[PDB]
Amino acid sequence: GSTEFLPGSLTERAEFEAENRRVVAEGGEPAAGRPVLMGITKASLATDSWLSAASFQETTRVLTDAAINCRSDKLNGLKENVIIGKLIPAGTGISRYR
Amino acid sequence: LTHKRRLSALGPGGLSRERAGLEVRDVHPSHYGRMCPIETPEGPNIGLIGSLSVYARVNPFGFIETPYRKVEN
Amino acid sequence: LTPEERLLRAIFGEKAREVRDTSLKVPHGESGKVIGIRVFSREDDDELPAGVNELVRVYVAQKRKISDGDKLA
Amino acid sequence: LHHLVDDKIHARSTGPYSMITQQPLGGKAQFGGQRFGEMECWAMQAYGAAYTLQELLTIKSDDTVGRVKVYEA
Amino acid sequence: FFDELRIGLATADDIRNWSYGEVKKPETINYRTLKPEKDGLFCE
Amino acid sequence: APVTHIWYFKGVPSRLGYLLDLAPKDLEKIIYFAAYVITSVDDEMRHNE
Amino acid sequence: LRGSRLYETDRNHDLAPRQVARYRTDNGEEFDVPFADDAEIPGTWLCRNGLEGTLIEGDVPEPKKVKPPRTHWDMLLERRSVEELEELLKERLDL
Amino acid sequence: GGLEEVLAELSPIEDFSGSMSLSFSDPRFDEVKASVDECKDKDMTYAAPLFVTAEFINNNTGEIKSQTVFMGDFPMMTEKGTFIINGTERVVVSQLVRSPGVYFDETIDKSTEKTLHSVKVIPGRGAWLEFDVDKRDTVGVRIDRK
Amino acid sequence: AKRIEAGLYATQKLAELAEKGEKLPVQQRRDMQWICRDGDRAKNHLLEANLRLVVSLAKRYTGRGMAFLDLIQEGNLGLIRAVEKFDYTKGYKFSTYATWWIRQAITRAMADQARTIRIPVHMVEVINKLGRIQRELLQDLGREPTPEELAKEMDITPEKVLEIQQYAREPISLDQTIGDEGDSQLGDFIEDSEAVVAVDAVSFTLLQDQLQSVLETLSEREAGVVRLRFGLTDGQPRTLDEIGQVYGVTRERIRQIESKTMSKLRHPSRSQVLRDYLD
Amino acid sequence: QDRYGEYFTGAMGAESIKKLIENFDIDAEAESLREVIRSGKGQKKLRALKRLKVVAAFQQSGNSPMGMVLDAVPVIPPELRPMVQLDGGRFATSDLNDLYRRVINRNNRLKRLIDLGAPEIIVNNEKRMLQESVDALFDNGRRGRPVTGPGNRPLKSLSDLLKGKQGRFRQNLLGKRVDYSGRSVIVVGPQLKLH
DNA sequence: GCTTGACAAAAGTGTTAAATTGTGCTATACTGGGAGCCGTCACGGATGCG
DNA sequence: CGCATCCGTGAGTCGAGAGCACAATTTAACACTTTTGTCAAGC
């Protein structure tokens, strides 16, 4: 509808619902979404962190897509933190205990 | 002694350790008397490397022959 | 040479020697008696690889007794 | 059998490093460091040992300044 | 202390700005005196 | 001479192919000097003459 | 098996004095070079973009003693004289 | 023998737009340069020199420049069945390889579930030739992987 | 060839007459430009005509650390030079003259671009001569020729032969497969020889700490002359006059102070603590 | 070209694609793709969706697709491609710096050919060679047969340095060798406590 | 302690002779390469041939 | 339009193992001068 989402793209339920409820106020035309099952490989490779996706598999394709999309990575994924050398955000590493 | 009687499926013109399925490394009935079914590596090379049998001989074409006793009547 | 090293040498009157030590030293954790030595010198034939003037081989033999951690079968 | 603890015991505290990655070399021939593989990192994350993992991956491997500062400390 | 890591598509201007000098010789090191050659690879 | 990055030229899918809508087989010939491609045509001038 | 590649007290308060120059290239790109107080600044410099740059102040125009390279015409002269070339030109001009 | 077989395979040779020819024959081994333990101690290969008689013929006149040529040092096998290369004892292990020939097989299709039969001719050297039967009941051939 | 020469002279004449004005009839000018264009076209046509000879000569030098197409390109550059130098008056076929230049260009390009470490042509010639002589000797001698015999045959000292052989070495790839598997390369075994050694880097800062503190302080102001003498305060060793250029101390007095300090600082009571950092 | 030279323009090589991208409007293409997606049903809809996936990236951003054509290739610092003097005077060099050399060589030759006005065939051949050299530098063996040096082993390109199981991501970032570590055979201690 | 003075012994420039290196040239005729190609094995997904 | 080909990607973790002729550029080599330090007597 009046949303930012491209048709046919996989969007998280949280973001989908947030966008629909944000646009319904003044736009009044939410997008339609069908639940879909996806495998572990595709689910992991669809993460929002390009660092972890590149580290997992298909480094060339992941880097190409990230470059053309020009998408930045927020460094909190329990896998890019080790790459950066920053202590992980789990266990003793969270702010509360740290 | 066992090194000199080693039969390998790898090397140029042979198999690749990453491209060898179950079928090639399994024991085949024709091995009897030519390739020992016991002696073979335990690790990933299981079934790709073997040893020549005691009585086995190599045909000039490269096929392994084994001796048998002729029995008639 | 660093200023501190220069002062240390001055107080001890030690020459800034032209050569640095590169002697062959026993690897870490090794031991045993020296049994054989072989020397090849380009002067007396000794057709060594180009640029090599001397080649020295030292053989060290040690007697190992069975101990904890050794593998038997 | 030829599996004796005498020739496989080496430990390391500090030794040679790699040219490019600046990480410790591997192998008993050099002062080889043990590899802290990906599965070990998964185990550390499962424990929640954020600090031990951080020091393993930075201080003890390739934090060039951190290595010498930690030795001095 | 990093906030985020952004990837993009490098342009000619960015590549030129990254550089401290143009390489215009395939020489790496001279055969005698084993020192880097001017304007080539490994140029000081 | 300008060159095209190999990653975007052919990567299954070809990013340049999708951007311009030229088939990879046709796009391949242009890059490696195998066939000409028209960059611009003057329609107004053609109609008047 | 080992290889080799081709520690002084750092101090920021005290450093050798320096003076900054200024160069323009053919494309109008400005560059700055810190030289020592000894000066002896050259009239032309090599910039990061691979083009010769000249002083902003506009002093010491170099003589430019370079000689032009040998051309096809010079190579022709070494095997032909003007008379034969003129005859050939006259012959061709008729057609 | 193997050396004789290879030499016969190589020769005779004539140049493009043939006008003169060359050939090799009669390999010969004379004697090992050194012995086993001398080679082991001195760090040198245990080989013997090889000589082959080469004949050069001029078709225009019918000349024969026949004489022996030194082919190099051929490593030799010791009594134990090992090769001493650079003072180190080495063993060459026999290799199991699919012999050249024509091989037929059959497979059950997935779409039609018909039995489809294929044959491949595997040479020592040369283009691969293989015939096939399709699920449309047609006999085809792929020549040189075309 | 005649068309090319005519075009060259036509353009040269046009350039010469441009300076002195003297506008010519339109027909003559048009004809002159037509001659120039025809000459350029003839030059090109000859080049495409002999590209096949270029390829034929280039295909002989494969497998010597240079791409086949690069050899072809260098050969055609040499052929361009040959065309520029070809003389039709001598009456010889163009191929006879072109082959020399094509071979020269190919060999020179190989010499200048076939090695990671570039060797000048004058050394490449010596190396090639050495190789040819060695190959010739191996056939008749039967054995491996020794350095001295080669040196005598080349009228040079054996040390020169050894130096040439050392120069002949080719760098090896740093990405090999030492390990018999796709697991380790050659770069994983070459230790860095410039990495800071921890313990050493500590000992030094202890030596700089146990020296600058004690022996310097017990010497009162006599420490200053020592510090400037060896430059341990700013890494700037100073000559005697560099102290007298500002301060009023004189030359010989500074040396006397240095000698006295040197003598008295070697006392074992204060010369034993610093006696363990000599190594 | 001879009949109607001034009525059109054509070209070959990366320059033609550069011109096409320069005079290629993205908003109109995105609009047309969206209208085809909402209207079409057959394979046209799938093609439009896939094309829009790429087109929208440049439309809804501050970056232009001109980056796909390169006017200046960067060079990695020498330390990451070291020329180390091995023991005994031998030199070991990463094959990466070999690839670079080739590029430069070809890039020089072209500059010469254009300078003296070589026939178009040779210039085009040189441009194609430069394209192939750059391609192999970025990704060896992708398009054609991989470039090989001594023996027959293909050269290690830039992409190979961080591509698979080896490289940097899975060999030097996610897990690495560490100091203050040892290894040895284990035996049973029955007198030990659990800790 | 602090200077002056008379002398070898090294730090620096000048100028030559020598070694190194970068280019050019050689005229019977010669005119489209050659390495190919070897048992996963399954999985998707894009491509391109008809 | 639709089917067959073709392509990319994945594979436990540690271990042990042809030549010559110039012209231009850089280097050693020697001679000599200036700076540095050394020894002696001194009040």
From Swiss-Prot, chain B:
Disulfide bonds: none annotated. Transmembrane segments: none annotated. It comes from the Bacteria. Changing S8 to L/P/W: Rifampicin (Rif) resistant; RbpA no longer rescues transcription in the presence of Rif, decreased affinity for Rif, no change in affinity for RbpA; tested in the Leu mutation. Changing L10P: Rifampicin (Rif) resistant. Signal peptide: none annotated. Belongs to the RNA polymerase beta chain family. The RNAP catalytic core consists of 2 alpha, 1 beta, 1 beta' and 1 omega subunit. When a sigma factor is associated with the core the holoenzyme is formed, which can initiate transcription. Interacts with RbpA, which partially restores Rif-inhibited transcription. DNA-dependent RNA polymerase catalyzes the transcription of DNA into RNA using the four ribonucleoside triphosphates as substrates. This subunit often mutates to generate rifampicin (Rif) resistance. Interaction with RbpA partially restores Rif-inhibited transcription; once the subunit is Rif-resistant however RbpA no longer stimulates transcription. Mutations in the RRDR sequence (residues 423-449) confer rifampicin (Rif) resistance. Rif blocks transcription initiation but not elongation. This is DNA-directed RNA polymerase subunit beta. It comes from Mycolicibacterium smegmatis (strain ATCC 700084 / mc(2)155). The chain holds residues 440 to 512 of 1169 of the full protein.
UniProtKB/Swiss-Prot annotation, chain G:
InterPro entries: RbpA_sf (IPR038638), RNApol-bd_RbpA (IPR025182). One of its GO terms (molecular function) is bacterial-type RNA polymerase core enzyme binding. Pfam families: RbpA (PF13397). Keywords: Antibiotic resistance, Transcription, Transcription regulation. Induction: Constitutively expressed during growth, increases slightly in stationary phase (at protein level). GO terms for biological process: positive regulation of DNA-templated transcription; response to antibiotic. Monomer. Forms a complex with the RNAP catalytic core, specifically with the beta subunit (RpoB); its binding site may overlap with that of Rif. May bind free principal sigma factors. HAMAP family: RbpA. Belongs to the RNA polymerase-binding protein RbpA family. This is RNA polymerase-binding protein RbpA. The gene is rbpA.
UniProtKB/Swiss-Prot annotation, chain H:
It comes from the Bacteria. DNA-dependent RNA polymerase catalyzes the transcription of DNA into RNA using the four ribonucleoside triphosphates as substrates. This subunit often mutates to generate rifampicin (Rif) resistance. Interaction with RbpA partially restores Rif-inhibited transcription; once the subunit is Rif-resistant however RbpA no longer stimulates transcription. Belongs to the RNA polymerase beta chain family. Mutations in the RRDR sequence (residues 423-449) confer rifampicin (Rif) resistance. Rif blocks transcription initiation but not elongation. The RNAP catalytic core consists of 2 alpha, 1 beta, 1 beta' and 1 omega subunit. When a sigma factor is associated with the core the holoenzyme is formed, which can initiate transcription. Interacts with RbpA, which partially restores Rif-inhibited transcription. This is DNA-directed RNA polymerase subunit beta. It comes from Mycolicibacterium smegmatis (strain ATCC 700084 / mc(2)155) (Mycobacterium smegmatis). The lineage of its organism: Bacteria, Bacillati, Actinomycetota, Actinomycetes, Mycobacteriales. The chain holds residues 75 to 220 of 1169 of the full protein.
From Swiss-Prot, chain J:
It comes from Mycolicibacterium smegmatis (strain ATCC 700084 / mc(2)155) (Mycobacterium smegmatis). Coiled coil: none annotated. Disulfide bonds: none annotated. The chain holds residues 245 to 439 of 1317 of the full protein. DNA-dependent RNA polymerase catalyzes the transcription of DNA into RNA using the four ribonucleoside triphosphates as substrates. Belongs to the RNA polymerase beta' chain family. The RNAP catalytic core consists of 2 alpha, 1 beta, 1 beta' and 1 omega subunit. When a sigma factor is associated with the core the holoenzyme is formed, which can initiate transcription. The gene is rpoC. This is DNA-directed RNA polymerase subunit beta'.
